[PDB]
Every structure is written in structure tokens, then in C-alpha cells.
CSV table of C-alpha atoms and ligand atoms in Angstrom, one decimal:
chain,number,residue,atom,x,y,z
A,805,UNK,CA,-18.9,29.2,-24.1
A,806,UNK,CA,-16.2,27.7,-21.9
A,807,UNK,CA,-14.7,24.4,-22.5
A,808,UNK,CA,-16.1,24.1,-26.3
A,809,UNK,CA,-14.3,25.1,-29.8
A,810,UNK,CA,-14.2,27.3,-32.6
A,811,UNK,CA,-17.6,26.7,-35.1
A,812,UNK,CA,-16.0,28.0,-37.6
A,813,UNK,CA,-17.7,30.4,-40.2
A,814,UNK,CA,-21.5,30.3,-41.0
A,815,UNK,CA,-22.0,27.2,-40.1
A,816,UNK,CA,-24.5,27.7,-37.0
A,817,UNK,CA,-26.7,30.0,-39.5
A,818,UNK,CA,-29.3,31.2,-37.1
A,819,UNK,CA,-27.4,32.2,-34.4
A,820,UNK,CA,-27.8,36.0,-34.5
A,821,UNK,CA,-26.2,38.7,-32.5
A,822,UNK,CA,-27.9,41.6,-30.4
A,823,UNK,CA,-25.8,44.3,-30.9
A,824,UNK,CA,-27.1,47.7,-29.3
A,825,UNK,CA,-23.3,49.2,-29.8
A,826,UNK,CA,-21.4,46.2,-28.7
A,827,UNK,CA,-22.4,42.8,-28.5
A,828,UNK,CA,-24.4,42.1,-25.7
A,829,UNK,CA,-26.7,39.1,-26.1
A,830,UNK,CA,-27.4,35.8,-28.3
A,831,UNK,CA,-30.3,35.0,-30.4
A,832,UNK,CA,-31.9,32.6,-32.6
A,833,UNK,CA,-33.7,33.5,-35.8
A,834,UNK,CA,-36.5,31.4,-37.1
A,835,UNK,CA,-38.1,33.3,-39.7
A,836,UNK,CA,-37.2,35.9,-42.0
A,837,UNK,CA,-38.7,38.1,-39.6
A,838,UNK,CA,-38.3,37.2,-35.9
A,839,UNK,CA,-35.9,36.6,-33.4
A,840,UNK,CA,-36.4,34.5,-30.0
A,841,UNK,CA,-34.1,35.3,-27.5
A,842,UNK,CA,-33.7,35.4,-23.9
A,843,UNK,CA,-36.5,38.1,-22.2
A,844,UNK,CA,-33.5,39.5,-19.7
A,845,UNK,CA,-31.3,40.2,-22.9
A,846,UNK,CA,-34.3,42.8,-23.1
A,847,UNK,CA,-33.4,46.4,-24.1
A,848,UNK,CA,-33.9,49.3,-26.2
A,849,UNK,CA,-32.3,50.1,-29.4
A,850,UNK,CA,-31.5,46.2,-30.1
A,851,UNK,CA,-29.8,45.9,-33.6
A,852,UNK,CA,-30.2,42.4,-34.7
A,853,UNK,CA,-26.4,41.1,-36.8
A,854,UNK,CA,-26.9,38.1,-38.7
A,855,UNK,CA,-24.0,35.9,-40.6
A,856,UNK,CA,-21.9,36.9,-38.2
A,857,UNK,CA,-18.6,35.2,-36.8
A,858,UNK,CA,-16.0,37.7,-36.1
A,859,UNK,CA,-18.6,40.4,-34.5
A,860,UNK,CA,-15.5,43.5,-34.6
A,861,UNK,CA,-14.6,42.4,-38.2
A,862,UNK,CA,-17.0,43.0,-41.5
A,863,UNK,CA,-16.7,39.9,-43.7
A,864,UNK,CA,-18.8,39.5,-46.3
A,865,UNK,CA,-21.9,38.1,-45.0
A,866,UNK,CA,-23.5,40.1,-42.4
A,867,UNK,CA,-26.8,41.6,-42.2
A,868,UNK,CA,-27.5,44.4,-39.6
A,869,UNK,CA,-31.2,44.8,-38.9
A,870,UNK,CA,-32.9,47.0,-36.4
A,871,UNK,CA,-36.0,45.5,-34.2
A,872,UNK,CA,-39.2,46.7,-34.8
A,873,UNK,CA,-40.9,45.7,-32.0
A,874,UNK,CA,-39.8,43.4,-28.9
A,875,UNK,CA,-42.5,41.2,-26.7
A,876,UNK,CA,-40.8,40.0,-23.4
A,877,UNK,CA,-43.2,36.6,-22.4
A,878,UNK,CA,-46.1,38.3,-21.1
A,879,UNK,CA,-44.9,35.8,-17.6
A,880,UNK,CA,-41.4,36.3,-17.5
A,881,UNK,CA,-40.1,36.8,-13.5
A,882,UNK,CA,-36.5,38.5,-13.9
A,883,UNK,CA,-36.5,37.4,-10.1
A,884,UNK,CA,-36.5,33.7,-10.8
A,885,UNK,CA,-36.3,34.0,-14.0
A,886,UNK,CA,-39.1,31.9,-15.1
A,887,UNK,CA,-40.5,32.4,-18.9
A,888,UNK,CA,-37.2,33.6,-19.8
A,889,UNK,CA,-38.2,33.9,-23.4
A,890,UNK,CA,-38.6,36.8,-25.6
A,891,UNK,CA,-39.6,37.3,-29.3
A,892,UNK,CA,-37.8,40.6,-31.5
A,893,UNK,CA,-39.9,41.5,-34.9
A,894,UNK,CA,-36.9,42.8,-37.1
A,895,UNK,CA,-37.7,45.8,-39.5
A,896,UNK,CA,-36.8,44.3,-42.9
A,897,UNK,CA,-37.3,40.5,-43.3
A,898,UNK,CA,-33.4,38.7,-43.0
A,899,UNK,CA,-32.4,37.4,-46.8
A,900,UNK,CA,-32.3,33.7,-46.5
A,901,UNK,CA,-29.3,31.9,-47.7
A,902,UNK,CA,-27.3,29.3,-46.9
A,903,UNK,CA,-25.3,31.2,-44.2
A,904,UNK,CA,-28.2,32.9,-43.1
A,905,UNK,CA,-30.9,30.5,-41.9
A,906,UNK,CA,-34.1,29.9,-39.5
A,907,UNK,CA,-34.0,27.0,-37.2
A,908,UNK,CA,-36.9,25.0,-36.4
A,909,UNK,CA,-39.3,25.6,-33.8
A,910,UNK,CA,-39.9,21.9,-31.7
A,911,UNK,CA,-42.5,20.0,-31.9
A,912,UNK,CA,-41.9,17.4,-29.0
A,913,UNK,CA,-39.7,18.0,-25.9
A,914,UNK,CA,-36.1,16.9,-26.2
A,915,UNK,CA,-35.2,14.0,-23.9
A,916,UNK,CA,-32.8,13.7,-20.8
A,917,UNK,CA,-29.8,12.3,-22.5
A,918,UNK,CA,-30.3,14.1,-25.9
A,919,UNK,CA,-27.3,16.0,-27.1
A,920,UNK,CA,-27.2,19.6,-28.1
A,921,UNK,CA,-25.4,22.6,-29.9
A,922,UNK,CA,-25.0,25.6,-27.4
A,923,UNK,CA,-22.9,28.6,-29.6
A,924,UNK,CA,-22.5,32.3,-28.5
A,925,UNK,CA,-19.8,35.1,-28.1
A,926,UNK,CA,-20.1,34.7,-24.2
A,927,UNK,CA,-17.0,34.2,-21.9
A,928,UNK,CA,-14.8,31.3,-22.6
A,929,UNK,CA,-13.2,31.4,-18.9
A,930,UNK,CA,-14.7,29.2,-16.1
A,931,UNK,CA,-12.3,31.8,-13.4
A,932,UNK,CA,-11.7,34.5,-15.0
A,933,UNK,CA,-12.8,36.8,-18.1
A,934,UNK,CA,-12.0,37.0,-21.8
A,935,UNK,CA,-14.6,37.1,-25.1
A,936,UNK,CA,-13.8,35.8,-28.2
A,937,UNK,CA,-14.8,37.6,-31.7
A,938,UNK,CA,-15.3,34.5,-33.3
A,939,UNK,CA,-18.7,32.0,-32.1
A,940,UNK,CA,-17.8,29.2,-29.5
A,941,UNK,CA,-19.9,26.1,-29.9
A,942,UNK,CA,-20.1,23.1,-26.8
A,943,UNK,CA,-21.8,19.8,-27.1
A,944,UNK,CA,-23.5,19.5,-24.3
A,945,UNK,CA,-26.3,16.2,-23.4
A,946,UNK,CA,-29.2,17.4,-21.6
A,947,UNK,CA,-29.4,16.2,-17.6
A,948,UNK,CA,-32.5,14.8,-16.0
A,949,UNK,CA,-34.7,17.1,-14.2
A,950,UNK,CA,-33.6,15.4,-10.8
A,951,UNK,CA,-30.1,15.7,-11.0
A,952,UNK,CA,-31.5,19.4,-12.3
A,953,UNK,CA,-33.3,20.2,-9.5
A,954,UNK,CA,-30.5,19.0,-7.0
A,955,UNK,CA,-28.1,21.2,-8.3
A,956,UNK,CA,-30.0,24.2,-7.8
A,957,UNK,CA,-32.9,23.6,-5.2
A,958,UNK,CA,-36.0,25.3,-5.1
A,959,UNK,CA,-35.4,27.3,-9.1
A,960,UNK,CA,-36.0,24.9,-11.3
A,961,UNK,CA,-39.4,25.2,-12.9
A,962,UNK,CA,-41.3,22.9,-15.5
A,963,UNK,CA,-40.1,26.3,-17.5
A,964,UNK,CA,-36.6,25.3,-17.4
A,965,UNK,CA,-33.8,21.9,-18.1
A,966,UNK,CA,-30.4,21.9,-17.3
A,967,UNK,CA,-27.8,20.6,-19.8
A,968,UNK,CA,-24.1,20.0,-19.1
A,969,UNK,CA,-21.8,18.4,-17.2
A,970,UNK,CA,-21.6,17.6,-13.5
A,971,UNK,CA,-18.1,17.4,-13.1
A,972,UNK,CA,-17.6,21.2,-14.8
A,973,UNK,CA,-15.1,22.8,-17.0
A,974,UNK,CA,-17.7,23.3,-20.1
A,975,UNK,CA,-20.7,25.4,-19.4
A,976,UNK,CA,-22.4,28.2,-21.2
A,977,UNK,CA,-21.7,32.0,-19.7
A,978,UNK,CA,-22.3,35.4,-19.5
A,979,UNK,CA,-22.6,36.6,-23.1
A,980,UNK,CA,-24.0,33.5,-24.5
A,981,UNK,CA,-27.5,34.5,-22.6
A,982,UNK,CA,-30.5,34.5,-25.3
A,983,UNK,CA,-28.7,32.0,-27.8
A,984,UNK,CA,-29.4,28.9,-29.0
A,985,UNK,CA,-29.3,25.1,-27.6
A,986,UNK,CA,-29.8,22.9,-30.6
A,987,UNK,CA,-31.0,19.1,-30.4
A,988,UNK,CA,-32.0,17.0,-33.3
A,989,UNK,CA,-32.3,20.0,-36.0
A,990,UNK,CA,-34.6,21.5,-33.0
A,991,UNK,CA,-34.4,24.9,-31.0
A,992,UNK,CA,-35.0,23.2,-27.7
A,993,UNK,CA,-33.1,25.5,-24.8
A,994,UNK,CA,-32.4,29.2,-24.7
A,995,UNK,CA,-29.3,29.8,-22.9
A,996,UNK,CA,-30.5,31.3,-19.4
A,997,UNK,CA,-28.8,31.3,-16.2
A,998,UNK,CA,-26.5,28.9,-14.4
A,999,UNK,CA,-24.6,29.6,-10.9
A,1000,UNK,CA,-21.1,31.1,-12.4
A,1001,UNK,CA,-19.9,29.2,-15.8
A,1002,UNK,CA,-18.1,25.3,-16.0
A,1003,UNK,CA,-18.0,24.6,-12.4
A,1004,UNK,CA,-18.7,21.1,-11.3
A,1005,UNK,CA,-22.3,20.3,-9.7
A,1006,UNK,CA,-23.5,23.6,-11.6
A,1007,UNK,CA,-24.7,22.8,-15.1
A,1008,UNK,CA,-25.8,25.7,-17.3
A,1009,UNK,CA,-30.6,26.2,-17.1
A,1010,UNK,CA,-32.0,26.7,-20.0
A,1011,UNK,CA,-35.4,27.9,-21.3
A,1012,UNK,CA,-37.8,25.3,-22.5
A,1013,UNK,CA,-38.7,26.4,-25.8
A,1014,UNK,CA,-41.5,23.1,-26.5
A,1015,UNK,CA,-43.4,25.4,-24.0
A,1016,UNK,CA,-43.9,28.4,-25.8
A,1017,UNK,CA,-44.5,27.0,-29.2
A,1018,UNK,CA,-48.0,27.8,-28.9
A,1019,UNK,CA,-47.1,31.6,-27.5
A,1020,UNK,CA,-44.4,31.8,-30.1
A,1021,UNK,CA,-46.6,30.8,-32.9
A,1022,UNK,CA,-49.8,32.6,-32.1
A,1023,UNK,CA,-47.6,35.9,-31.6
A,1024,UNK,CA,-46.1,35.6,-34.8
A,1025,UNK,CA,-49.3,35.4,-37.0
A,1026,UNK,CA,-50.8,38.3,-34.9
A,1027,UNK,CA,-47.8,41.1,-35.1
B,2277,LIG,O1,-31.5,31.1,-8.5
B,2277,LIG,C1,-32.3,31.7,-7.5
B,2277,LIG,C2,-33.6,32.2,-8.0
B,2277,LIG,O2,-34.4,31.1,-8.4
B,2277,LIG,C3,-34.3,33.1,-7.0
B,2277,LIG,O3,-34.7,32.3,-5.9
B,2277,LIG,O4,-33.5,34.1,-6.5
B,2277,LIG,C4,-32.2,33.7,-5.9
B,2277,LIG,C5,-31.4,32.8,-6.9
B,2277,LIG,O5,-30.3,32.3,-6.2
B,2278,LIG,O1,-25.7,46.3,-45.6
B,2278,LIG,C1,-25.0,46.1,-44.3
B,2278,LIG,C2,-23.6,46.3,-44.4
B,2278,LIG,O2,-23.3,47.6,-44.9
B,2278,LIG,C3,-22.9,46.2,-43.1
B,2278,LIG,O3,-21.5,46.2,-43.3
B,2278,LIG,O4,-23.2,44.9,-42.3
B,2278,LIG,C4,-24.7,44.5,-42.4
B,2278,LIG,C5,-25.2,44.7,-43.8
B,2278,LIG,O5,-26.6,44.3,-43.8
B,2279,LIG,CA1,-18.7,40.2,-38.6
């Protein structure tokens, strides 16, 4: 997150962590049991760390689960990334408390204009690099898919929104990839791609998570 603030503790309860030995990707956990995240966080020996806000510091209120199973979008393209969704089944169901807590899955599209909570441990530098241990949040509105596809021509599929700002300096970044974008009580964006991080005419693309409610659903009651 560059340009945004401190959270604080707990209080964005189902962003997770993918840990495989460091922390490496976001998530979002919306059941006791599964995590969506983005499908190019993919890799093996994904730990899943819940209740987390200082990732190097135990506090009181983690829980480290190992995934079960993973199931990148059976359409994903890592070239353009299109479908950049992906589903982890965690071994032992996550205990559900108040710091520790599903979001819910949309059931309508959020709107061009609708602002959004976009958290992760990704870099908080627009030129530059340093990663914080505690979770950045950024209020962010959601742009219209013609100032979208302007930005970037020619990669901006009905699989994908940009949210942001046009003038720069607060963006999403490498390391906040698979986490949440939150409108409304609703996960409606995974944090994807974006063409470096804060820099003006070069809002962050996110996954369009109203698409894959169906896919995300129908998975779920079948693994
Ligand atoms: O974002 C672009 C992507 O959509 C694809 O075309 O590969 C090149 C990237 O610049
Ligand atoms: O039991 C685990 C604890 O030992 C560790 O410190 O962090 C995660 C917890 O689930
Ligand atoms: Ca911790």
C-alpha cells in the first residue's frame, strides 16, 4: 500500500497472509475453510497466517494454517493475467472470532464511484522499496471502465476494474497482490496488477470477484 495508513490491529479481520517462509502474498478468507486469493500468488507449500498485523512479531492472535489443496481459475492467463483468481482449502477450519473473520462474497457488481478498503503488507514506496510489518490500508473509489481502459489499452477485460487515483501517489503494490478490495461490507476486487505502484495515469487493476461467485461457490460445495 503506498500513500494509505496504519489499520491498526485486527480490524481488517479477513485479510490473511500467505506465508511459505516469508510473507509473500495477500488473501481474503471467507469461510472457515477457504481462502481467495490472487491465482499468480500461486505456489507450493502456501501456509495460510490469519489475525495477523505485525507478520515478524507473534501477538496473541494468530492462526498458522497449511493449505490443503489450491485451485488456480481453471481460465487464468498469467500472460494477461485474465481470471486472476484463485481459491486455497486450508487443512483445519480458521476459529471464528471477532479478529478472525470471513468477508462476504458479492452479490451485485460494485459501481464506478463506489469506495473501497484495499490492505496488504506490499510496498509502501511509489520509487523506491521498503515493507512494513504492520497492514497498510488505502481508500481508494473505483474508476469507470473508460478512464480504465485508457490507462492501460488493449488489457483491460470484463475480468478486471481499475480503482485509484489518476493523479498518483496512492496505489496498491507489489506485496499487496491476492488481497482484498472491500466496498460496501463486499469482497469486490482482488488486488492484481497495475503498471508500477502510485504513479499518476496508472491506477492499480483489480480482479472482479461478482464474476466468479458462481465458480467460487460451486467449488466450495464440491471440494
Ligand atoms: O499489461 C500487458 C498485458 O495485458 C499483456 O499484453 O502483456 C503485456 C503487458 O504490458
Ligand atoms: O498455534 C499457533 C501458534 O503456536 C503460532 O504462534 O501462531 C499460529 C497459531 O495458530
Ligand atoms: Ca503476527
Amino acid at each position: 500500500i503506498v500513500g494509505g495508513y496504519t489499520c491498526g490491529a485486527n480490524t481488517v479481520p479477513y485479510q490473511v497472509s500467505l506465508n511459505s517462509g516469508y510473507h509473500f502474498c495477500g488473501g481474503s478468507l471467507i469461510n472457515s475453510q477457504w481462502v481467495v486469493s490472487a491465482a499468480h500468488c500461486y505456489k507450493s507449500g502456501i501456509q495460510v497466517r490469519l489475525g495477523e498485523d505485525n507478520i515478524n512479531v507473534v501477538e496473541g492472535n494468530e492462526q498458522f494454517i497449511s493449505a490443503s489443496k489450491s485451485i488456480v481459475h481453471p481460465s487464468y492467463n498469467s500472460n494477461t493475467l485474465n481470471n486472476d483468481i484463485m481459491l486455497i482449502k486450508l487443512k483445519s477450519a480458521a476459529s471464528l472470532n471477532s479478529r478472525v473473520a470471513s468477508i462476504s462474497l458479492p452479490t451485485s457488481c460494485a459501481s464506478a464511484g463506489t469506495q473501497c478498503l484495499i490492505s496488504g503488507w506490499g510496498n509502501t514506496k511509489s520509487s523506491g522499496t521498503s515493507y512494513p510489518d504492520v497492514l497498510k490500508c488505502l481508500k481508494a473509489p473505483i474508476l469507470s471502465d473508460s478512464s480504465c481502459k485508457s490507462a492501460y489499452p488493449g488489457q483491460i477485460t470484463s475480468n478486471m476494474f481499475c480503482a485509484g487515483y489518476l493523479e498518483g501517489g496512492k496505489d496498491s503494490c507489489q506485496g499487496d497482490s491476492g488481497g482484498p478490495v472491500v466496498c460496501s461490507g463486499k469482497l469486490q476486487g482482488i488486488v492484481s496488477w497495475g503498471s508500477g505502484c502510485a504513479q499518476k495515469n496508472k491506477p492499480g487493476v483489480y480482479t472482479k470477484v461478482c464474476n466468479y461467485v458462481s465458480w467460487i461457490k460451486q467449488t466450495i460445495a464440491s471440494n
